[PDB]
Design a protein around this nucleic acid. Structure first.
Lengths: 182, 690
RNA sequence: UUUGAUGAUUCAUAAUAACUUUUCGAAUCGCAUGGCCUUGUGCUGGCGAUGGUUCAUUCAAAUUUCUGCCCUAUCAACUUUCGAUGGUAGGAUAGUGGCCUACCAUGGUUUCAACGGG
RNA sequence: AUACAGUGAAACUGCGAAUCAGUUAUCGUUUAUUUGAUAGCAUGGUAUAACUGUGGUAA
């Protein structure tokens, strides 16, 4: 069958073709997300702790597994000591950097004095001759505008109350006038 | 697509007046009986607003047949200005354009109204600021430029009077008002031929003590013709500006003419500035010229520029002029003549510092001559340690006067250093690095605080007996320069026996885990040097995992894998190697500058030798953040009080501020020693995170 | 002499007591960003975009009162069969309400053209 | 415009997808929407889309 194996820390993934089906015979009637050891199933890969993903059968449809799952996938849960060729050595970067303010503050350990604005991820995209550097965004950041709007909400609440409970008194003045009348 | 909905300030940004550049067939080209009557009845038809209707009902008996206007001039003018001083926003365009038309029919008889009309106009521009309507501003400034277009024949001598009238627009401190009104006044400047413009430039320079940006906008708008084309009167306007300049005006007027020249040079590209350069060179042939010359050499006949500069130097500012001429010159002969002038140019340390910050090229002859002519400036210039011009620094540092080297050797022989003579010896040894026996003697006398120790270690790295004395001092022991000295001694047997005689390297292998990554890198490079001069696989893995520390997302994704592999090797595999691996793991977990590496450290701290130094180091890290270390060395005070040649520009102000900060760094010796103490390595940090 | 009314109220509304698998009382956005002077990096402040508690309005739905249409006595009896028709409670209901459950009652329709059929 | 600032595909979110006839009441129901009133922590965490890749599959 074919085994897509993915190293998670690099995040790389490559496929294998597994003959000697009595290696595959220990995968059978075993539930999804259970432990698989490296040398215990196969020959070359050593100490690679796995867990099966389940997934697609013959012609691609998805607990107790049969031999229809041609595309079997694994993530390397714990690497042993086998030196793989495109999984453990060649590293692919994690793609999207952190976007939120406190997410960046966790990603670089910032305190409550930093007001980050330089711990943003950067990227330069290259036309070939004229470069375009870019700083994306710091969203959910405390701005001068946000506490201004908070102040405006405070002012609106206090102004609505400080009109309402006084208009009550100017109604009570006319009620007192009619009570002196009658 | 339509419907964009630009904001109010957005429309104001799109606005520019230019009515003679606005070309339609409006009403005025098609003239009936009066010139006023056509624009009256046309506006009566197209616009309805209630006060404009009752105004029309008031003036309809006297609008038609221009004899009626010339009889009833004053009365309907008072009706006009009363309705503009009434001013609802919807009536503004008809009444205001009619008041614009009300001068074109008459001519000279409007000058008895002109001042009061402009008074109502400026009061309504203030009301327009509180109205917030770009259409209102467009109409009002448009009718003002119409008035100036129709009355430029009579507003020749009264330029000073009308700009003194309109000075609440120029110095308003609300810059788009002045940017509007400067266009109208600049059209008047383009009108007025020579002598009245000279008197106007004199009075405008004299009244300068937010009017500066307004005068800059008026000059730039007077020069502002069509795109990539200068004004036809620009060569004479520059002549009147330079005649009002050259010690006939105040201090800020020189920077005003500078900024006007800067904006005009940015506008007119290349060929439009031939006659401008000719008129400016003719005005510069007589002999303030310095800010003008630096301004004209900013924006990039350089031989004629060099000739005029040589005359004006035959007779800071000359340093900035020579720095800009070096950054944009094209003649090596002129560069050699500039070296001849650099013989007579003082503050050559600051000049060479700004020039090396600018570029790095040929003709480096005068540096050795300035070194032979020969304090704190030379100290700071040698203190510029690792530059891109270090290849020329390490080759030309020998060319100094060695009499100063042997004189510093006489000061480095004896050292009675209590508190500040150690700093004096630091200033001596900084220059003496560019100059071994006296080094070892003074180091023995000095070891017999942190800044003086780091400076002695710098002279130690600049310098087997010396290695034995350095190992004895390291057993007697800032630490970054000390590890620099140790690695320089270890890389720059008998040494095997001398290192095997003294037991060491356990303290450095334990305290390699500091809160500074450069200190960690220096300790890791020093310990491998000691193990080389007297295992290596795991040490080189720990050095290489700390080598790829530029934690960009590719390299930061790579570093968790590299640290996991090296930690798996050193954990599945001596006491010194265990101490070095524990110090590297503690440094990686206590960096707290990347959470990528602090996940690899939290992974690698799971299979270590049980409680060897793990919980002890964890208690040390938890106890490191209860109090903090401080109190670096102090210095005296100094005062530049200098370095100004500009007031306000876009990029010229930034370049002048950079040269001013350069001169304040090359200021007096107390500030120079304070900057030298600021020039340090990292230290302990990251409180609350560890 | 204390309170808002309709034809009409356990109506509108206010007070206590606790229950809330604890509802809401803005972790929101665009344009300007002006002021107070103890110039902090403070405190303030405009226009309007969304949201959101309750009431009213508006637009609706779903039921409900009264009349009607195809021919017939070679259709005179029809509905309480395994709900028929009420009353009492409960459940369902968005609710009045056999829409249903049990319990109490044995009703109700009809020669008037009903009931059935064309 | 070294956080962001122009246009902006994709995607999430938000919004919207026998007629019976005349005929009264809803003090028997709800009333999305519009409209008008209406309520005295410098702001934290998920769990993911588009995308990068590994495939199956005639599809």
């Amino acid at each position: 069958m074919k085994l897509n194996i993915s190293y998670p820390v690099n995040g790389s993934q490559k496929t294998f073709e597994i003959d000697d089906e009595h290696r595959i015979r220990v995968f059978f009637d075993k539930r999804i997300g259970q432990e698989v050891d490296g040398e215990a199933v196969g020959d070359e890969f050593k100490g690679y702790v796995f867990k099966i993903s389940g997934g697609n059968d013959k012609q691609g449809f998805p607990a107790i597994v049969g031999p229809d799952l041609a595309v079997l996938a694994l993530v390397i849960v714990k690497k042993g000591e086998q030196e793989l060729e495109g999984l453990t050595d060649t590293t692919v970067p994690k793609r999207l950097g952190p976007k939120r303010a406190n997410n960046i503050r966790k990603f670089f350990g910032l305190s409550k004095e930093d007001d980050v604005r330089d711990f943003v991820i950067r990227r330069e995209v290259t036309k070939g001759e004229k470069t375009y550097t870019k700083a994306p965004k710091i969203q959910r950041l405390v701005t001068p505008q946000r506490l201004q709007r908070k102040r405006h909400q405070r002012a609106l609440k206090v102004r609505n109350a400080q009109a309402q409970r006084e208009a009550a008194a100017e109604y009570a003045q006319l009620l007192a006038k009619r009570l002196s009348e009658r | 697509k339509r419907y964009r909905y630009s904001s109010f300030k957005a429309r104001i940004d799109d606005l520019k007046i230019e009515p003679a550049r606005n070309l339609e067939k409006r009403v005025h080209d098609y003239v009936e009986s009066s010139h006023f009557l056509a624009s009256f009845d046309q506006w009566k038809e197209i616009n309805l607003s209630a006060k404009f209707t009752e105004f029309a009902a008031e003036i309809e008996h006297d609008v038609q047949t221009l004899p009626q206007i010339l009889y009833h001039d004053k009365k309907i003018f008072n009706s006009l200005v009363s309705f503009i001083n009434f001013h609802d926003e919807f009536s503004l365009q008809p009444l205001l354009d009619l008041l614009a038309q009300f001068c074109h029919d008459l001519g000279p008889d409007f000058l008895k109204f002109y001042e009061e009309a402009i008074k109502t106009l400026i009061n309504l521009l203030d009301a327009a600021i509180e109205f917030e309507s770009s259409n209102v501003f467009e109409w009002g400034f448009n009718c003002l430029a119409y008035i100036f277009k129709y009355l430029s024949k009579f507003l020749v001598k009264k330029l000073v009077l009308t700009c003194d009238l309109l000075i609440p627009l120029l110095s308003h401190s609300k810059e788009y008002l002045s940017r509007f009104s400067a266009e109208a006044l600049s059209f008047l400047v383009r009108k007025c031929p020579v002598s009245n413009l000279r008197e106007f430039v004199r009075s405008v320079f004299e009244k300068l003590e937010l009017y500066e940006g307004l005068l800059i906008l008026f000059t730039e708008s007077m020069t502002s013709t069509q795109e990539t084309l200068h004004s036809k009167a620009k060569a004479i306007m520059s002549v009147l500006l330079h005649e009002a300049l050259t010690k006939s005006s105040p201090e800020r007027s020189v920077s005003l003419l500078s900024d006007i020249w800067m904006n005009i040079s940015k506008y007119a590209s290349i060929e439009s500035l031939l006659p401008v350069y000719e008129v400016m060179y003719q005005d510069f042939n007589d002999s303030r010229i310095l800010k003008v010359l630096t301004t004209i050499v900013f924006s990039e006949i350089p031989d004629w520029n060099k000739i005029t500069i040589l005359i004006e130097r035959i007779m800071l500012s000359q340093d900035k002029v020579a720095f800009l001429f070096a950054l944009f010159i094209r003649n090596s002969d002129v560069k050699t003549l500039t070296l001849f002038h650099q013989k007579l140019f003082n503050y050559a340390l600051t000049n060479i510092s700004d020039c090396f910050l600018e570029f790095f090229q040929f003709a480096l002859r005068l540096s050795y001559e300035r070194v032979f002519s020969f304090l704190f400036l030379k100290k700071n210039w040698q203190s510029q340690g690792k530059k891109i011009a270090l290849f020329f620094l390490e080759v030309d540092d020998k060319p100094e006067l060695q009499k100063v080297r042997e004189v510093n050797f006489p000061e480095e022989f004896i050292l009675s250093i209590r508190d500040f003579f150690v700093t004096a010896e630091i200033n001596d040894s900084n220059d003496l690095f560019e100059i071994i026996f006296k080094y070892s003697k003074l180091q023995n006398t000095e070891i017999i605080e942190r800044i003086f120790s780091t400076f002695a270690s710098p002279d130690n790295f600049t310098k087997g007996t010396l290695l034995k004395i350095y190992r004895k001092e390291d057993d007697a022991s800032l630490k970054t320069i000390l590890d620099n000295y140790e690695n320089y001694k270890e890389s720059l047997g008998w040494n095997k026996l001398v290192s095997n005689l003294h037991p060491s390297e356990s303290l450095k292998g334990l305290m390699s885990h500091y809160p500074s990554l450069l200190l960690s890198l220096t300790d890791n490079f020093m310990l491998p040097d000691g193990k080389i001069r007297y295992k290596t696989l795991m040490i080189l893995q720990g050095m290489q995992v700390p080598d790829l520390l530029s934690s960009c997302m590719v390299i930061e994704e790579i570093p968790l894998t590299l640290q996991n592999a090296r930690d798996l090797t050193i954990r599945i595999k001596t006491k010194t190697d265990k101490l070095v691996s524990s110090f590297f793991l503690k440094y990686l977990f206590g960096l707290l500058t990347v959470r990528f590496s602090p996940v690899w450290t939290g992974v690698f701290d799971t299979l270590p030798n049980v409680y060897t130094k793990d919980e002890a180091l964890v208690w040390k890290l938890v106890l490191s953040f209860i109090k903090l270390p401080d109190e670096n060395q102090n210095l005296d005070y100094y005062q530049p009080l200098l370095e100004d040649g500009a007031n306000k520009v876009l990029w010229d102000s930034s370049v002048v501020r950079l040269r001013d900060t350069i001169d304040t760094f090359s200021h007096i010796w107390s500030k120079y020693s304070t900057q030298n103490t600021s020039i340090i390595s990292t230290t302990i940090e990251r409180r609350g995170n560890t």
